[PDB]
């Protein structure tokens, strides 16, 4: 997260870290949506050009963390994966279309003051909240600058950007399965997700029922926090049917 600030303790209890078992390596962000399911970006698990094509056994997740590197006694939980599910139509060769994946935990994790799931949006909630100018929140332990890494979880709030504006800001082909967010050239405010934040959640707090909903997944961008550019996110509601199918299955 570039130009954000430290998260307060317990501020994003659905935040998940995705690690490579050996060598141990913090790979990406992810989010907890139930006691046994974690949502992330498909490119964190499958992106051949970066030599990424992981199986359940290659990975591990840590939940409840705040510090990026220090062990947090009786707070953080480690979980193994039972199965990974990547969207069947994820397009890594072209534009990361449908950059989404589910991971089933080998065992349900216990909720606590530091571990708690985020909500997935229903049609009504998506219609009301996913509108240009409305702000969402992104969190992660990714790079502090385009390139270094934070000692603790970072957070930044960003406005959803009008589709045509997103489209004219890049030559990369955008689809309905993505949305972009970020401040404009004139705005004094700045901020963006960056490398390493992929898979992390773009959440919004409903002013109707006071619950936090995950509307997006950090997916891609060109550089980080450059004026004139915007960060791109996987559109969660758009892929909600696939998500439901995997979980029901």
């Amino acid at each position: 997260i570039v130009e954000g600030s430290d998260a307060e303790i317990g501020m994003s209890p659905w935040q998940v870290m995705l690690f490579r078992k050996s060598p141990q390596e913090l790979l990406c962000g992810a989010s907890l949506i139930s006691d046994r399911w974690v949502l992330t970006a498909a490119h964190c698990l499958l992106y051949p050009p970066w030599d990424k094509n992981f199986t359940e056994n290659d990975l591990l997740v840590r939940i409840g963390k705040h510090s990026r590197t220090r062990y947090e006694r009786n707070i953080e939980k480690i979980s193994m994966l039972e199965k990974i599910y990547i969207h069947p139509r994820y397009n890594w060769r072209e534009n990361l279309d449908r950059d989404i994946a589910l991971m089933k935990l080998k065992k349900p994790v216990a909720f606590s003051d530091y571990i708690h799931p985020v909500c997935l949006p229903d049609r009504e909630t998506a219609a009301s909240l996913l509108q240009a100018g409305y702000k969402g929140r992104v969190t992660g332990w990714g790079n502090l600058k385009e390139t270094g890494q934070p000692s603790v979880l970072q957070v930044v709030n960003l406005p959803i950007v009008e589709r045509p504006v997103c489209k004219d800001s890049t030559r990369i082909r955008i689809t309905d399965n993505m949305f972009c967010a970020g401040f404009k050239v004139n705005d004094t405010k700045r901020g963006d997700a960056c490398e390493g934040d992929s898979g992390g959640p773009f959440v919004m707090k409903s002013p109707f029922n006071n619950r936090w909903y995950q509307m997006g997944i950090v997916s891609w961008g060109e550089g980080c926090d450059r004026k004139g550019k915007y960060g791109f996110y996987t559109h969660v509601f758009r892929l909600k049917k696939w998500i439901q199918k995997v979980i029901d299955q």
Partner: peptide
């Protein structure tokens, strides 16, 4: 279920340091 309600914030009726920024964006 209980999703989206944080134990240290909503459950204790406490506001985090920047969520007001999101609420206010629903106006402007």
């Amino acid at each position: 279920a209980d999703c989206g309600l944080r134990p240290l914030f909503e459950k204790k009726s406490l506001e985090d340091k920047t969520e007001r920024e999101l609420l206010e964006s629903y106006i402007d």
